[PDB]
Amino acid sequence: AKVLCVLYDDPTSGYPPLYARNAIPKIERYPDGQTVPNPKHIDFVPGELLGCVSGELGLRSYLEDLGHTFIVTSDKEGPNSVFEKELPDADIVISQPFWPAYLTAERIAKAKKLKLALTAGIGSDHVDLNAAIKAGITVAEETFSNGICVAEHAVMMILALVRNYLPSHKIAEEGGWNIADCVSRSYDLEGMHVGTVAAGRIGLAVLRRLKPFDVKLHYTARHRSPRAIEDELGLTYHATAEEMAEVCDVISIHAPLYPATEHLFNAKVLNKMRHGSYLVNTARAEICDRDDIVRALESGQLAGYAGDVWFPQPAPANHPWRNMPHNGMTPHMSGSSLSGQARYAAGTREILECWFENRPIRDEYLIVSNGKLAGTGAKSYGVG
Amino acid sequence: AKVLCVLYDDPTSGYPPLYARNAIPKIERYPDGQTVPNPKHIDFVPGELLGCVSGELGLRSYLEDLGHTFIVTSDKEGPNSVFEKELPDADIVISQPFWPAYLTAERIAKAKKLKLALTAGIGSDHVDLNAAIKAGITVAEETFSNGICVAEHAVMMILALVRNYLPSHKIAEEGGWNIADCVSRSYDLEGMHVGTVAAGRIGLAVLRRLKPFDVKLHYTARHRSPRAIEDELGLTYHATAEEMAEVCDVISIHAPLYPATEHLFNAKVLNKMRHGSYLVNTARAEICDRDDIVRALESGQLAGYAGDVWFPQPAPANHPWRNMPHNGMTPHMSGSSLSGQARYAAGTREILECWFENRPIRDEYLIVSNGKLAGTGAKSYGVG
Numbered sequence: 001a002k003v004l005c006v007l008y009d010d011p012t013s014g015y016p017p018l019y020a021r022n023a024i025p026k027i028e029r030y031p032d033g034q035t036v037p038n039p040k041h042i043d044f045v046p047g048e049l050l051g052c053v054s055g056e057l058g059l060r061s062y063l064e065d066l067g068h069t070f071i072v073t074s075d076k077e078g079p080n081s082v083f084e085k086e087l088p089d090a091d092i093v094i095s096q097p098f099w100p101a102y103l104t105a106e107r108i109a110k111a112k113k114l115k116l117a118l119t120a121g122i123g124s125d126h127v128d129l130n131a132a133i134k135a136g137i138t139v140a141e142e143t144f145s146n147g148i149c150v151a152e153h154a155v156m157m158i159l160a161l162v163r164n165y166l167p168s169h170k171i172a173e174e175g176g177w178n179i180a181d182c183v184s185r186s187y188d189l190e191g192m193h194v195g196t197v198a199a200g201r202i203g204l205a206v207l208r209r210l211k212p213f214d215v216k217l218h219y220t221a222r223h224r225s226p227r228a229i230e231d232e233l234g235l236t237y238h239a240t241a242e243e244m245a246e247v248c249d250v251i252s253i254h255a256p257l258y259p260a261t262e263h264l265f266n267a268k269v270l271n272k273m274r275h276g277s278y279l280v281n282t283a284r285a286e287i288c289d290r291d292d293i294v295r296a297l298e299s300g301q302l303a304g305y306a307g308d309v310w311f312p313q314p315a316p317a318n319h320p321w322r323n324m325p326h327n328g329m330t331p332h333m334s335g336s337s338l339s340g341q342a343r344y345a346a347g348t349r350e351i352l353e354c355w356f357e358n359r360p361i362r363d364e365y366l367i368v369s370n371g372k373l374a375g376t377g378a379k380s381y382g383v384g
Numbered sequence: 385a386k387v388l389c390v391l392y393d394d395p396t397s398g399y400p401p402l403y404a405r406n407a408i409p410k411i412e413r414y415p416d417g418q419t420v421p422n423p424k425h426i427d428f429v430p431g432e433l434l435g436c437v438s439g440e441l442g443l444r445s446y447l448e449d450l451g452h453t454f455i456v457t458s459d460k461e462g463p464n465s466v467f468e469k470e471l472p473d474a475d476i477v478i479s480q481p482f483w484p485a486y487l488t489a490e491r492i493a494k495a496k497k498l499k500l501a502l503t504a505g506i507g508s509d510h511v512d513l514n515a516a517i518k519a520g521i522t523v524a525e526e527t528f529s530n531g532i533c534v535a536e537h538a539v540m541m542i543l544a545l546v547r548n549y550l551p552s553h554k555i556a557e558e559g560g561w562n563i564a565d566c567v568s569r570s571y572d573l574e575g576m577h578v579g580t581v582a583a584g585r586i587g588l589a590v591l592r593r594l595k596p597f598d599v600k601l602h603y604t605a606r607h608r609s610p611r612a613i614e615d616e617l618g619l620t621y622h623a624t625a626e627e628m629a630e631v632c633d634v635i636s637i638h639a640p641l642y643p644a645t646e647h648l649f650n651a652k653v654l655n656k657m658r659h660g661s662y663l664v665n666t667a668r669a670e671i672c673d674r675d676d677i678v679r680a681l682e683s684g685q686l687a688g689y690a691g692d693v694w695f696p697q698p699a700p701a702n703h704p705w706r707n708m709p710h711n712g713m714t715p716h717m718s719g720s721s722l723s724g725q726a727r728y729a730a731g732t733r734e735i736l737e738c739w740f741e742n743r744p745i746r747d748e749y750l751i752v753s754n755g756k757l758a759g760t761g762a763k764s765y766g767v768g
């Protein structure tokens with residue numbers, strides 16, 4: 001088979017990078033009991049940079065020894081990119097959400113050999129799922145592989161916004177002190193009302209991390225969580241995002257992107273919050289209305305916004321989220337921490353081993369299978 | 385009586401600042417059961433900026449209606465400052481750790497009428513406690529008033545360092561994407577060994593917030609914390625900082641500054657840490673050896689350092705912690721969040737009410753009284 005794999009470019013300083021440490025923690029299970037990936041072998045040391053062109057997700061020896069061809073590129077934009085030129089006869093396509101090879105309906109039609117669209121990471125919305133369903137393509141991802149990474153990044157951003165960390169660090173760097181300027185917009189998180197959109201794998205991980213900050217917790221969901229979870233954490237449930245928006249000082253988004261969540265957080269919802277609220281989005285950018293977020297920050301309706309997700313990806317140099325007021329953005333990096341990469345690279349290999357050996361891909365990894373939403377896709381996504 | 389009060393300058397934009405929100409959460413009690421301050425009245429709305437010259441800690445009407453004189457200044461450096469000029473006949477001196485009016489033995493000797501040195505906030509190491517003891521000066525601070533603020537700031541900084549937030553935000557602001565550059569030094573906190581120096585009010589708050597991140601928790605103290613605490617958090621105790629350094633990926637300092645803790649974190653301790661470890665210090669700068677920290681970052685012995693405390697304060701524009709590699713510094717701001725300010729300003733007034741009415745200052749607020757370490761000072765500090 002031909003495996004076509006799109007990864008981001010190597011570090012500016014070169015590959016490999018100079019690693020700050022020589023090992024990372026050993027993770028065996030996710031909080032819900034799911035085991036970390038179980039490929040037969042891995043051809044990397046956990047902690048290595050795997051998600052860039054030279055890193056290759058550690059897959060080359062494995063694929064070529066079986067007689068498959070493995071094409072790796074970062075060049076993914078337009079009909080003249082390496083990606084689109086190599087697409088028509090690729091059996092399998094792999095890319096990461098951080099540098100996504102979009103499989104639009106038009107591209108799927110051109111992909112005459114495509115049978116498996118494999119996300120390296122979590123979130124397969126860069127694939128047109130309706131088109132994949134119609135084309136009979138399997139869509140899968142490494143569920144939970146980098147979910148805790150996102151949960152940490154989200155809680156970090158909540159804190160940085162509320163406490164006014166980023167402008168205060170700039171003052172330290174620039175030679176200032178200026179305590180009054182630092183703290184004129186600095187609040188404690190303690191006692192605020194904080195809500196998550198969804199309490200899935202990441203949403204629940206965030207709620208658990210927020211609990212000892214002594215905030216009052218809220219959430220919305222497609223499907224309400226068990227009573228035991230609500231009792232454990234002291235959750236207040238809301239039937240809609242609008243309802244939650246009315247009562248929360250901070251909201252963090254943790255739902256997947258699909259038609260029913262597209263532009264969920266637009267002006268109508270933003271305006272339901274109390275002036276000077278905070279919004280963190282480490283889910284997907286288009287869950288928010290891009291320009292309404294800017295407008296909310298310019299008016300102070302939002303006191304701050306932060307996230308690592310953008311649309312499109314990569315974000316153009318002039319994307320308005322870069323320099324809008326009171327933002328805490330990063331490029332899309334959370335799930336690509338070196339710790340996270342170890343797990344999703346291992347899961348990518350695990351899935352390929354199953355696929356090539358005619359064994360099932362884990363149900364929890366499935367998004368689309370045999371012409372319908374399947375596995376986690378059937379539980380978490382919609383196509384309406 | 386004459387009250388001499390040193391506060392930091394007003395915001396550059398003017399006073400009052402434009403507030404992001406009009407109200408803050410109501411806190412009634414601290415986690416150990418201690419009640420928040422109980423002055424008879426407050427002359428401010430919680431949420432207002434109080435720690436600057438125009439804010440006056442909300443004290444002017446209270447003091448002036450009682451016939452006391454109230455001098456507020458930010459000018460605190462040298463014998464020609466408003467502070468040192470007004471000092472000789474001041475009965476009471478108040479300042480905040482964030483912009484501290486240092487009471488050196490020399491200044492205390494000039495202060496012929498000084499009977500009460502009152503810290504607005506937590507931590508009174510800017511007062512020479514030996515000289516205060518000699519002169520029969522009462523030293524007090526508002527215990528717990530901004531402890532949660534510091535704990536939040538410390539956990540925020542831990543995440544920012546480990547995850548490589550700050551350089552990644554700069555990339556987003558500058559128009560880049562560069563995922564490999566962002567994540568070449570980005571790790572999850574999950575599964576790391578994290579230790580605190582002390583498990584006092586702030587240290588315990590930090591340990592509780594760290595717990596749901598699924599880290600392995602350690603601490604060092606002169607004596608063990610209660611079994612209930614160790615069991616709750618799954619704590620591993622170490623007799624010395626050196627011992628804890630050997631096993632932790634991340635350490636956060638939460639002990640007071642006095643002779644036994646001065647330069648505790650010097651090369652000897654730092655070199656016990658594994659190469660690529662992280663250190664956070666929101667306690668006092670001089671618990672670390674300033675230049676040993678710089679060199680540890682330059683060599684990669686530490687992968688990162690962050691804190692909001694410096695020496696001296698304010699830090700000179702050329703202070704080496706500002707631009708040393710891989711830092712997450714802010715000016716000294718954590719305890720002066722608007723949320724914290726409401727509490728310590730209320731407590732400052734409570735202490736003044738007791739003092740003027742000839743009633744005891746709360747034992748937990750006392751550091752020095754009746755010529756010796758007293759209250760919290762006797763339990764937490766030393767005088768070598």
Ligand SMILES: NC(=O)c1ccc[n+]([C@@H]2O[C@H](COP(=O)([O-])OP(=O)(O)OC[C@H]3O[C@@H](n4cnc5c(N)ncnc54)[C@H](O)[C@@H]3O)[C@@H](O)[C@H]2O)c1
Pocket residue numbers: 097098121122123124144146147150197198199200201202203220221222223254255256257260261282283284332333334335336376379380381
């Ligand atoms: N750094 C990254 O790129 C990265 C990594 C992981 C996840 N993510 C994003 O976060 C999303 C969630 O991740 P997860 O691991 O928790 O997946 P998950 O499937 O376990 O949880 C998603 C939850 O969202 C709920 N949901 C669906 N529609 C909703 C709606 N309209 N309103 C409220 N809730 C709704 C689902 O029921 C589900 O419980 C991913 O789809 C992905 O987009 C990004």
Ligand SMILES: NC(=O)c1ccc[n+]([C@@H]2O[C@H](COP(=O)([O-])OP(=O)(O)OC[C@H]3O[C@@H](n4cnc5c(N)ncnc54)[C@H](O)[C@@H]3O)[C@@H](O)[C@H]2O)c1
Pocket residue numbers: 481505506507508528530531534581582583584585586587604605606638639640641644645666667668692693716717718719720760763764765
């Ligand atoms: N960044 C900020 O804004 C800020 C604000 C306030 C206070 N602080 C600092 O944090 C310090 C602690 O605050 P707290 O409220 O938790 O006070 P605390 O008195 O409750 O806790 C101090 C703890 O340190 C322990 N300790 C004393 N000597 C020690 C030693 N030699 N080694 C290890 N542990 C030792 C004490 O026993 C005690 O448990 C303050 O003294 C202050 O310096 C920082």
